[PDB]
Every structure is written in C-alpha cells, then in structure tokens.
Amino acid sequence: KVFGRCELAAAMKRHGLDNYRGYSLGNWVCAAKFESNFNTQATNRNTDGSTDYGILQINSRWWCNDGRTPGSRNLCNIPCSALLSSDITASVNCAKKIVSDGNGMNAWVAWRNRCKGTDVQAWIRGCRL
C-alpha cells in the first residue's frame, strides 16, 4: 500500500507515535516519506547483505528475521515480511523499540539528513488530526 500523507499521519497518531520519546508526529511522517516514499512494500539491500524493509526501512541485521542475514539478531521478534503489510502495526511497534535504544531517530539516515532541523510540522499541515 502507498499511503497518503494525511492518511499515514492519522494512522501513526492512532498507534501512539505523536510525541513518542519526544518526537512530534511530523518527524515520523517526514522519515517515512524519505525512507520509503510512503510505500509499505519498499525493500532495499545493503552492502553488508542485510535488507531494509517497509515504510520505515527497518534493517534485518538487528531487528527482524529474513532468513538470509547470517549472524544477525531479531530484536523485534518478527519476520521481516511482516513489515511489508498494509497494516502498519508491526512497523510502528518495532520502530518504538528502535527509537528507545539510546540513539533516537538518528537510527534513520534519511531522518538525520533530510528531516532533522527542518520545519517538520509542515508534513502534517492541512491534515484533519
């Protein structure tokens, strides 16, 4: 599924991301825009052989099991394919664990380079919510 901007903002709010660990909703919508273009089916392979999955491009070296990242962890206790569902519950729950692990949203390279320090509430302006 490819979300609309305000549709995704509403879904993220319902699942408890607005102000989660101090990050306002616009940060999460900005991160999803540049990580995946709002597409739950996005995948990208990394040079170390791990793959990033889903609307927040969660990585198989630490967070999910894809059966082909030897010597990796599965800290969200999920198959990576669950991160590609049209239902974003699994991605949101795993993202809450990532952002809690000490490094905040700096775990998402696109957030650090394209969202951090910008007017992120622009991403939810005009939305009913």
Ligand code: NA
């Ligand atoms: Na893994």
